């Protein structure tokens, strides 16, 4: 019956079944899902199976200065039109099948390490094109609710940085994963740290700190050493602009504790100029590649002390057994000093 | 053709601007744009007499791009 | 590329306040914003 027919919107809303107890709690999963298709997309008003040529609707109204008359395509000429529409339909399907594949993260199914692009431009014509965003953790958090039972939300941790010392991180929370991505990355650029870098490639000194239960030990390294660090530290270091560093993470490997523990340690590093000013002495760098040449890296801006720094015959500094065990060669590990891709 | 009181001259410069837009957005824009010599000289002169000198100075490039002779009156003004 | 068709200005802008309105709506017709 003609009167029992419905519109396409009604038919797709029913067929897709996006509203319902199945879609309320995700009670239904969709390895095979009905996908909405616009069936009026490639359709031309006036074109039908019979192949009639209606002047002014599907063919031009005037031809050679005269009004065209009703005509019908030949059986052969109409098959070509039908065949051409089928090919155009598979070509359109091929255009949708051709989607550019994006680079993966730390692993194929992991969100960690994936770039989210620059943060969105602020309301007052503010822009962050110089900043890159990286995901550090995407978690599904499940909240038990008084009336609705277990609900699913997303907690995301992302880090931002411009590669020139300015970097930050923020947590994002939302019911949708892409709304959380927006919140974290936009928020992160308003909580930026500035990180001091020695010669714009490494840290100024070895950093050993604990944040809660996560211990991070970082070592200053020369050029060409690369980033031999926990994968998250590698990601964060590329955003900061650190090229050469060793880091060892022990204790609880909690991504959030690691991130904020890392930023706390990198933000409290004393530069060579700060050391020179504090002690009113020259900071002299001795490099084995340059032999005995003394390279003054920093000099105090104020007066220069005349009394040498006391030379304690033996320093009362606390040592790391891992560092000492290595220096002596007693540290044997099949996993240390393994060949890895450039980082 | 001739100079007019400031009120009229301002009105003639708003019309020449809309005409300029018509020359710029012709349907023959697919092909090369044909800017007659008289049209360019008049549109430029109307901007000066209206006080929109900034727009007139910009148009001087279009005499060289299309190789159209500038009119004597335009150069003196 | 052909320019998209631009709707003309409503002909109300050409109507005088002392016109013969019965000539505009001589017979029953639906409301037309461009004509009222």
């Amino acid at each position: 019956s003609f009167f029992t027919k419905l519109t396409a919107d009604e038919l797709w809303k029913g067929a897709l079944a996006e509203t319902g107890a199945g879609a309320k709690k995700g009670r239904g999963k969709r390895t095979k899902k009905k996908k909405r298709k616009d069936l009026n997309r490639g359709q031309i008003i006036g074109e039908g199976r019979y192949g009639f040529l209606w002047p002014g609707l599907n063919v031009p109204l005037m031809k050679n200065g005269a009004v065209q008359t009703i005509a019908q395509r030949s059986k052969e000429e109409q098959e070509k039109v039908e065949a051409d529409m089928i090919q155009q339909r598979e070509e359109w399907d091929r255009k949708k099948k051709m989607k550019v594949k994006r680079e993966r993260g730390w692993s194929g199914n992991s969100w960690g390490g994936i770039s989210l692009g620059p943060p969105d431009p602020g309301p007052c014509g503010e822009t962050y094109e110089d900043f890159d965003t990286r995901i550090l953790e995407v978690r599904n958090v499940f909240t038990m609710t008084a009336k609705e039972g277990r609900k699913k939300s997303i907690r995301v941790l992302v880090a931002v940085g411009n590669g020139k010392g300015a970097a930050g991180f923020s947590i994002g929370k939302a019911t949708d994963r892409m709304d959380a991505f927006r919140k974290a990355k936009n928020r992160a650029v308003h909580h930026l740290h500035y990180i001091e870098r020695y010669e714009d490639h490494t840290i100024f000194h070895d950093i050993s700190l604990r944040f809660k239960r996560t211990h991070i030990k970082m070592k200053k390294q020369p050029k060409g050493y690369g980033l031999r660090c926990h994968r998250a530290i590698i990601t964060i270091c590329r955003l900061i602009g650190i090229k050469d560093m060793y880091a060892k993470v022990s204790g609880s490997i909690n991504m959030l504790s690691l991130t904020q523990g890392l930023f706390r340690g990198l933000s409290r590093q004393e530069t060579h100029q700060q050391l020179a000013d504090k002690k009113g002495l020259h900071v002299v760098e001795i490099r084995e590649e340059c032999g005995p040449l003394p390279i003054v890296v920093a000099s105090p801006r104020g007066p220069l002390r005349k009394d040498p720094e006391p030379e304690d015959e033996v320093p009362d500094v606390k040592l790391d057994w891992e560092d000492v065990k290595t220096a002596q060669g007693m540290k044997r590990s099949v996993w240390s000093n393994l060949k890895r891709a450039a980082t | 053709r001739d100079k007019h009181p400031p009120e009229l001259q301002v009105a003639f410069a708003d019309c020449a601007a809309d005409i300029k837009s018509a020359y710029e957005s012709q349907p023959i824009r697919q092909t090369a744009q044909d800017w007659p010599a008289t049209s360019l000289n008049c549109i430029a002169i109307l901007f000066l007499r209206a006080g929109r000198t900034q727009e007139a100075w910009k148009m001087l490039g279009l005499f060289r791009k299309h190789n159209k002779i500038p009119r004597s009156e335009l150069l003196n003004e | 590329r052909p320019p998209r068709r631009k709707a003309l200005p409503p002909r109300t802008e050409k109507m005088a306040v002392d016109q013969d309105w019965p000539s505009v709506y001589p017979v029953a017709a639906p409301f037309k914003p461009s004509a009222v």
Binding site: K99, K101, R104 | P27 | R5, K6
Partner: peptide, 15 residues
């Protein structure tokens, strides 16, 4: 997400 990056002039009497 990883598989696929998801996918003026007006004039009177135009001819």
């Amino acid at each position: 997400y990883l598989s696929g990056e998801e996918v003026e002039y007006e004039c009177y009497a135009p001819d």
